[PDB]
Amino acid sequence: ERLLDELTLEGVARYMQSERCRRVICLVGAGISTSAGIPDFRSPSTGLYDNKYHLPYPEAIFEISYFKKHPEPFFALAKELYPGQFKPTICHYFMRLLKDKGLLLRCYTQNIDTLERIAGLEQEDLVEAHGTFYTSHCVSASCRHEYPLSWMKEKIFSEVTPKCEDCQSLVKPDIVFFGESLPARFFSCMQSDFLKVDLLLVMGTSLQVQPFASLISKAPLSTPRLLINKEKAGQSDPFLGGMDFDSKKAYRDVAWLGECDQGCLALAELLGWKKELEDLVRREHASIDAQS
Ligand SMILES: Cc1cc(C)nc(SCC(=O)Nc2ncc(Cc3cccc4ccccc34)s2)n1
Ligand SMILES: [Zn+2]
Known about the structure:
The protein is an alpha/beta fold. 35% of the residues are buried. The chain has a six-stranded parallel beta sheet with strand order 3-2-1-7-8-9, sandwiched between helices. The protein is globular, with a radius of gyration of 20 Å. The chain has helices at 9-16, 64-69, 72-81, 90-100, 115-118, 149-158, 184-193, 260-271, 274-289, and strands spanning 24-28, 104-109, 126-128, 131-138, 146-148, 171-175, 199-203, 225-229, 253-257. It starts with 8 loop residues before the first helix and ends with a helix. The structure holds the ligand Cc1cc(C)nc(SCC(=O)Nc2ncc(Cc3cccc4ccccc34)s2)n1 and zinc ion. The site of zinc ion has 8 residues, from loops. One of its GO terms (molecular function) is NAD-dependent protein lysine deacetylase activity.
């Protein structure tokens, strides 16, 4: 009774091009941006937090109340970690193709780098589960003046603590600090989207950070779930208690292990989309390289 004829990338592609598959939800994380030269900010082994701030504890750099009273460490770190270029990956442009072809219901992302937007996903297509640098707001509840990334970038590089032009309050990028809630939009969209989904495409996430990881359990029981990731992820934790790729009871979950770009390339090829994807990426990359 299962929807995939076989538990392979080939099976997923046949399903995608069948009448049964109309709405795809993508769940994406840091693994879709590493090939764009953006490291994984949640990892301690990427050396981003290797080093004067006098933090009452090392975690305070991520905490909202600390930020509000001592914003300088955050903004110094933001300058240090600011990417040299913003060129979305093959994986990002694969999602743009999903959008173009009327298959994209939603992209839920853990990333803050804005590459989904640069690749042409719109606000309505996105749930930025950990917020984004794309916009920043004055922290004063009575004001909330919104500032674009161009404005915020200028403040970060000039090492001027960003203050609101209307009220002189601190201006904070719309990323979710420890102590802040996840965006309201995350919960709203989750409630509706997973009633409507035909395929989950899970790319570049290890599914270890909650509540993002729990999204896979919101899929209907029949909905195929394809993981494209360097490592297998999402199975039940044998210590406590999921994806089932390999047991005799597996029926809908498929793992393609490798670089996300290569997995998306392989899937696009099966779909007859490889030329379209190559043409889109090369054109967009050229346009970004040519920014004058
Ligand atoms: C600075 C910048 C600007 C743009 C457009 N894109 C990037 S992507 C590269 C990157 O990893 N950067 C980062 N900026 C801040 C980081 C740590 C951090 C600290 C405190 C709170 C956090 C709240 C939520 C998330 C992280 C938080 S990592 N980086
Ligand atoms: Zn203000």
